[PDB]
Design a protein around this ligand. Sequence first.
Ligand code: VO4
Ligand SMILES: [Mg+2]
Length: 239
Amino acid sequence: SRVRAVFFDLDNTLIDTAGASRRGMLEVIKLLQSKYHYKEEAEIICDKVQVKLSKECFHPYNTCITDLRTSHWEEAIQETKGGAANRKLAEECYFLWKSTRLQHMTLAEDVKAMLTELRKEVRLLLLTNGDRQTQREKIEACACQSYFDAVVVGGEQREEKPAPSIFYYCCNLLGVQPGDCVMVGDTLETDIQGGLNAGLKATVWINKNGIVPLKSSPVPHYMVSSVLELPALLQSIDC
Ligand code: VO4
Ligand SMILES: [Mg+2]
């Protein structure tokens, strides 16, 4: 009845993806406004891209995603500004956005110290959705793979969260039973729903911003604001 494995989301759970991604946007705005003499049109372009990205995370992706997310910019520039297509400016914007966010994707020192002290009591797995190319780059950017007994990327797999199969696979990977695992993540629709679907021992929601969820949304077993609260939490579930 003791916890034998803990699964961890990556984005906005272990690394500040959102903060990093907006930092990239800020640089793109800084670029367009200063260099290419833009005003408030730049901020509109970034919003269009941001919503374009959301309507593309559909699974199972195809590659090259680079060509896709780059096209997301040229489609965005033309809508706000206008004129002929500018693949060069789109290429610049994307890689500036990409290079910026990846450098800000790092594991905090106290987060590293938490993961290190935790894997000597339970096994650790990294369970993240997204395409192979994009996610693996993040993994390398924050060098987290060294901290986990296993890493599983949804794009590389048959199904992602919240589908229970990918959870069952993680369990087989570590030779454990779903009832011995706890899922930790910050998205209800994937991390939490998935944990409930796959009958895991517990689900832990990361809610630092203090969202009050709808009654119809998945209900976690636990709710905390930081991943630093797990050791005490996991010790209370008895491990
Ligand atoms: O690391 V994720 O929040 O895209 O499952
Ligand atoms: Mg997340």
